[PDB]
Every structure is written in C-alpha cells, then in structure tokens.
Design a protein around this motif. Structure first.
Motif, short mmCIF file in Angstrom:
data_model
loop_
_atom_site.label_atom_id
_atom_site.label_comp_id
_atom_site.label_asym_id
_atom_site.label_seq_id
_atom_site.Cartn_x
_atom_site.Cartn_y
_atom_site.Cartn_z
N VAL A 1 0.84 -1.19 0.00
CA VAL A 1 0.00 0.00 0.00
C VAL A 1 0.87 1.25 0.00
CG1 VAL A 1 -1.69 1.35 1.30
CG2 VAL A 1 -1.87 -1.20 1.18
N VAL B 1 -2.32 7.01 0.59
CA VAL B 1 -3.55 6.49 1.20
C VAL B 1 -3.72 7.03 2.62
CG1 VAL B 1 -4.83 4.44 1.91
CG2 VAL B 1 -3.46 4.38 -0.18
N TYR C 1 -3.44 5.04 6.44
CA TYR C 1 -2.87 3.69 6.42
C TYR C 1 -1.59 3.58 7.25
CZ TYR C 1 -2.75 -1.10 4.79
OH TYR C 1 -2.79 -2.49 4.74
N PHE D 1 -8.68 -2.28 8.17
CA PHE D 1 -8.82 -1.05 7.39
C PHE D 1 -10.05 -1.02 6.49
CE2 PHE D 1 -7.42 2.34 4.46
CZ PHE D 1 -6.88 3.24 5.36
N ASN D 2 -10.71 -2.16 6.32
CA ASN D 2 -11.85 -2.23 5.40
C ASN D 2 -13.11 -2.81 6.04
OD1 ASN D 2 -10.45 -1.65 2.57
ND2 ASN D 2 -9.10 -3.03 3.73
N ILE E 1 -12.89 -4.75 -1.20
CA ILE E 1 -11.61 -5.18 -0.63
C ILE E 1 -11.82 -6.02 0.63
CG2 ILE E 1 -9.44 -4.43 0.46
CD1 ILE E 1 -9.37 -2.08 -1.45
O1 LIG Z 1 -6.69 -2.12 2.46
C1 LIG Z 1 -6.73 -1.21 1.64
C2 LIG Z 1 -5.55 -0.84 0.79
C3 LIG Z 1 -5.45 0.66 0.79
C4 LIG Z 1 -6.74 1.22 0.24
C5 LIG Z 1 -6.79 2.34 -0.59
C6 LIG Z 1 -8.02 2.82 -1.03
C7 LIG Z 1 -9.19 2.19 -0.63
O2 LIG Z 1 -10.41 2.65 -1.05
C8 LIG Z 1 -9.15 1.08 0.19
C9 LIG Z 1 -7.93 0.60 0.63
N1 LIG Z 1 -7.88 -0.53 1.46
#
Ligand SMILES: O=C1CCc2ccc(O)cc2N1
Length: 115
Positions: free
Chosen positions: A38, A43, A46, A88-89, A95
């Motif tokens: 990443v 980003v 992060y 993170f998601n 993702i």
């Molecule tokens: O886990 C990640 C990788 C970094 C990242 C960048 C943009 C996004 O919308 C979502 C993510 N999720």
C-alpha cells in the motif's frame, strides 16, 4: 529437553510448497488489493493505523531471499495481510470481501498441504 529429541516433521520441501501456495495466491482473481505494498504517501490513515504493512510481493521477496526461518513465520506474514485488510476495510466492501475470500483460500491450501 537436553538430549531428549522429539521426532519432527520432514521440513525439506517446505520452501517449495510455500512458494507454490504463494503462486496460487498471487494468481487468484481477488488478489489485486494485496499484490503490492500500500502506498503510504497516498492512502490516508494507512501509515498510522496499520503498524505492520504486508503484501504478497514483500512475502515473495522474503521467501526468495531466505528471510523465513520456518513455515510458520511464512504463514504469519500471509495472515497479517488479511488481518490488516480487516482492520482497514468494512466487511461489506470489495476489498473487505476480497480479504475474507483470500483468507479462506489460503487456510484450505495450508491445511491440505501441511496438516
Ligand atoms: O486495504 C486497503 C488498501 C489501501 C486502500 C486504498 C483505497 C481504498 O479505497 C481502500 C484501501 N484498502
């Protein structure tokens, strides 16, 4: 203990087997969020949130250069990829779903190959 040894796994094929599993990971159609590190400059959040970033290309480099002492340290890095993904998601994101899918895919290969 001293001079009292367990029988242990034949570990001589572990490097080759882990490499095969990683190849299968790399070529899975849902691998795209995990192929490269990443971009911590681009980003938001992060770098601060994810204390130990990990990705398949970094795992591949470590596996190719003798940086995993054993197969368990390899599995720890693979799981770290998916643990980071969950941190993170949202589960209900492309993702988030990709990470859950890839985790399931990995753990079956792991079980089938070594257990
Ligand atoms: O886990 C990640 C990788 C970094 C990242 C960048 C943009 C996004 O919308 C979502 C993510 N999720």
């Amino acid at each position: 203990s001293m001079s009292v040894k367990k029988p242990k796994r034949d570990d001589s094929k572990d490097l080759a087997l882990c490499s095969m599993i990683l190849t299968e990971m790399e070529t899975h159609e849902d691998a795209w969020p995990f192929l490269l590190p990443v971009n911590l400059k681009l980003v938001p959040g992060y770098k601060k949130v994810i204390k130990k970033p990990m990705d398949f290309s970094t795992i591949r480099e470590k596996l190719s250069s003798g940086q995993y002492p054993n197969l368990e340290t390899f599995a720890l890095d693979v799981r770290l990829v998916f643990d980071n993904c969950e941190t993170f998601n949202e589960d209900d994101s492309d993702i988030g779903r990709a990470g859950h899918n890839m985790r399931k895919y990995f753990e079956k290969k792991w079980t089938d190959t070594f257990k």
